[PDB]
Amino acid sequence: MNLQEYQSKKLMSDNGVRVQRFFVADTANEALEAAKRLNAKEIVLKAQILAGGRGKGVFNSGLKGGVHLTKDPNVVGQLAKQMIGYNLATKQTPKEGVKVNKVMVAEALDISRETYLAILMDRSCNGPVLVGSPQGGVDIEEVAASNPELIFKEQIDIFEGIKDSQAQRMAENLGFVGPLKSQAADQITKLYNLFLKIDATQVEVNPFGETPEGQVVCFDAKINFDDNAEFRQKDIFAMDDKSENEPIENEAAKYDLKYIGLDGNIACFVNGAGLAMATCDIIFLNGGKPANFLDLGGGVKEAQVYQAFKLLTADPKVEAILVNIFGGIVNCAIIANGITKACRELELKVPLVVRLEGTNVQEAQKILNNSGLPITSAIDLEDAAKKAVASVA
Amino acid sequence: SYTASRQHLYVDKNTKIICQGFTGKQGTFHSQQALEYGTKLVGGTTPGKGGQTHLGLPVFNTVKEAKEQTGATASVIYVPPPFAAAAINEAIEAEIPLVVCITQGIPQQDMVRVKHKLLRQEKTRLIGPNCPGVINPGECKIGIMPGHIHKKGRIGIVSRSGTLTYEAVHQTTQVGLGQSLCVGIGGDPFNGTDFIDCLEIFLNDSATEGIILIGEIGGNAEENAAEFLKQHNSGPNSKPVVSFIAGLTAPPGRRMGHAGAIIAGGKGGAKEKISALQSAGVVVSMSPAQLGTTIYKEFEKRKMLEHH
Numbered sequence A: 001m002n003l004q005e006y007q008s009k010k011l012m013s014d015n016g017v018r019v020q021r022f023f024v025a026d027t028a029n030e031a032l033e034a035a036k037r038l039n040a041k042e043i044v045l046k047a048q049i050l051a052g053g054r055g056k057g058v059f060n061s062g063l064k065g066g067v068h069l070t071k072d073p074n075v076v077g078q079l080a081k082q083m084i085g086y087n088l089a090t091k092q093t094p095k096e097g098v099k100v101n102k103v104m105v106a107e108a109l110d111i112s113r114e115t116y117l118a119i120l121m122d123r124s125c126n127g128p129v130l131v132g133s134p135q136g137g138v139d140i141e142e143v144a145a146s147n148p149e150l151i152f153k154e155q156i157d158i159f160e161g162i163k164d165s166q167a168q169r170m171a172e173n174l175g176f177v178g179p180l181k182s183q184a185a186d187q188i189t190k191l192y193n194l195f196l197k198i199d200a201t202q203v204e205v206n207p208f209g210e211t212p213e214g215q216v217v218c219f220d221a222k223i224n225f226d227d228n229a230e231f232r233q234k235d236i237f238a239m240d241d242k243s244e245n246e247p248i249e250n251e252a253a254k255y256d257l258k259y260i261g262l263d264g265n266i267a268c269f270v271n272g273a274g275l276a277m278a279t280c281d282i283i284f285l286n287g288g289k290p291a292n293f294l295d296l297g298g299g300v301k302e303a304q305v306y307q308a309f310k311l312l313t314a315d316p317k318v319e320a321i322l323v324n325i326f327g328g329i330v331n332c333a334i335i336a337n338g339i340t341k342a343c344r345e346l347e348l349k350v351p352l353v354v355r356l357e358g359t360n361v362q363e364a365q366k367i368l369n370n371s372g373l374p375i376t377s378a379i380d381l382e383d384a385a386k387k388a389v390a391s392v393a
Numbered sequence B: 001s002y003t004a005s006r007q008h009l010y011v012d013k014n015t016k017i018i019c020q021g022f023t024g025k026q027g028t029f030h031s032q033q034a035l036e037y038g039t040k041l042v043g044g045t046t047p048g049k050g051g052q053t054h055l056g057l058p059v060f061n062t063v064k065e066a067k068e069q070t071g072a073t074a075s076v077i078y079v080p081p082p083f084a085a086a087a088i089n090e091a092i093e094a095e096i097p098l099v100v101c102i103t104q105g106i107p108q109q110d111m112v113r114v115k116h117k118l119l120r121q122e123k124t125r126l127i128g129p130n131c132p133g134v135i136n137p138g139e140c141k142i143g144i145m146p147g148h149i150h151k152k153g154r155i156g157i158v159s160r161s162g163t164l165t166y167e168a169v170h171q172t173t174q175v176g177l178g179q180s181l182c183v184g185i186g187g188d189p190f191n192g193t194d195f196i197d198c199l200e201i202f203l204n205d206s207a208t209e210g211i212i213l214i215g216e217i218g219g220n221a222e223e224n225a226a227e228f229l230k231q232h233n234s235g236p237n238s239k240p241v242v243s244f245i246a247g248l249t250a251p252p253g254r255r256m257g258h259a260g261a262i263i264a265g266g267k268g269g270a271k272e273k274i275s276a277l278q279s280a281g282v283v284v285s286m287s288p289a290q291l292g293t294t295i296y297k298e299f300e301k302r303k304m305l306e307h308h
């Protein structure tokens, strides 16, 4: 799931993390009044979209740039008038851009020092870990490659909680000194408790830094959430902005199907994520370009097969479909009849290749061959992949 | 330490099983299936239904009581995600030797807490969560895998996937080699058993003459297993290892179905896992359709077939 800048910044602030003071406005007048209420010397206006590259984007109002600095609340309102309700296009958006319904009006803070600080569960140490670097404001992966001596880690015990000694040591390794070390340690502690409270998989602060006036601030952050915890994080998942997701992925999620679009033309779906990945792979190994990953989940349910076809028959780049169902006990003739039912009712127009394993496969293949539809059966996954690849120009 | 419980993975004809979540929809269906396979399912738990009967077997309020009355040495968990970690902890506190958690969707943070307890004891061995279970073909099946495709034989299989494992099972049955023990360690990032745990069992089991390791993107368990094999599968009586790693075509930063299948911060890609394993002597099958033929050929090279 995805949060707008103002949603993650509010979540942070509501949990004691120090961020720039800000308001959200959805009209130009609200932006002007918000700028007045900041009582700040320097103000930043930022359009709220999820895609990157706002700073160099263009609105279909003609206004250049999604981030503007000013001292004048009147200017904030005037520029917001040429943002709100317009589409903002960046290097990371489609050409139509993204409709901007909200802007953030925040105090513009100068940055004296930049560091990197993230909290995540360590898959090799089996607990939370703090990951920090004094080399802030840059891709942490680059820092790891170029300067691995500047990557610091503190393993935390889930039941002990974060200790002052751990927070202080990380703060020191990040380069904070004196009272700012104590501030940074306290902020690390608050970020750790936030990470646990919200079932984050990662809380990444970059830059985690200082202002010239001597405050430790989380200037920008990215939070990733554990989907498995949605049942106890309803308020946070209710904020999920799906407006910039691929539309078919949104439609898939409605039905508990995990769809991931790829850049290809041979669609596929499979019961089981490992085998779904493997089916994408084997299409590629045999000279094709998979169009998507689609895991139907456990249990071969006719409704899941039906919805899968509904998703794929929509995508204009799909030129063929490889269905791979390893159903064990389920009667493949029932699955076969469900497939022909879906292809008729949803008007399949592309070649379909079906690999069925389970019981009653012979009758299932007979059903598919007699359906009058462009359907071919496959004897194994390699045969299915070759047939799929050869079904397209 | 917790590694002392690895031997509990090797279920057999004497393993007696209780089902946690016995009276639920999936606990009922797979318990019915287990009794047809001849599985020694002896009862199950549902809090508040102790004293009832289900599928002709006793229902219990606690794992402790179920264990005392049935003598069970293993439990299988079909408990919903909000409560499944508590179910695992209950089984651990009751010192069930083998616990197999099928449940998908347990919060990762719950499982970090579970592992904290798990790693500080050694009576209980956990397989899972988000896994299909374990099977000793013809002796004991714990979980949801289709028994009929297995055949007792000489390939040990360990896998992070469900149905992709059945592909490997089907292929090794078809080529006539069969399986000694198959362990689905599941698709979550925090779980009770990794590849090394199973490799240790396989390398020291005389019935296991070759190994298939099925992995995928995410984490570093495959790379850890490669290092283990460099150190412990190199002397005389080494065993052939074949592998397939799912996710060569996976994009970065996306959860590919399984909670643990994600390339993050540039780590977890399939290519690096394939190269690590190859450098440890593993024959990595690039195609998932050729696991059986690849391991068969390795048996042929070593003259491990009956016609030799």
Ligand SMILES: CC(C)(COP(=O)(O)OP(=O)(O)OC[C@H]1O[C@@H](n2cnc3c(N)ncnc32)[C@H](O)[C@@H]1OP(=O)(O)O)[C@@H](O)C(=O)NCCC(=O)NCCS
Pocket (backbone or CB within 6 Å): A298, B020, B021, B022, B023, B024, B025, B026, B027, B045, B046, B047, B077, B078, B079, B080, B081, B083, B086, B087, B102, B103, B104, B105, B130, B131, B132, B144, B161, B162, B186
């Ligand atoms: C675990 C799972 C199967 C449960 O779904 P379900 O069987 O449809 O759920 P139900 O609500 O019918 O049954 C769960 C039962 O557990 C019981 N239960 C709850 N807490 C319990 C506990 N601590 N101990 C024992 N039983 C418990 C519930 O009371 C319920 O039984 P009841 O209806 O008789 O009271 C499901 O959540 C799931 O994870 N499915 C996917 C599994 C999967 O694909 N795994 C990966 C394989 S590779």
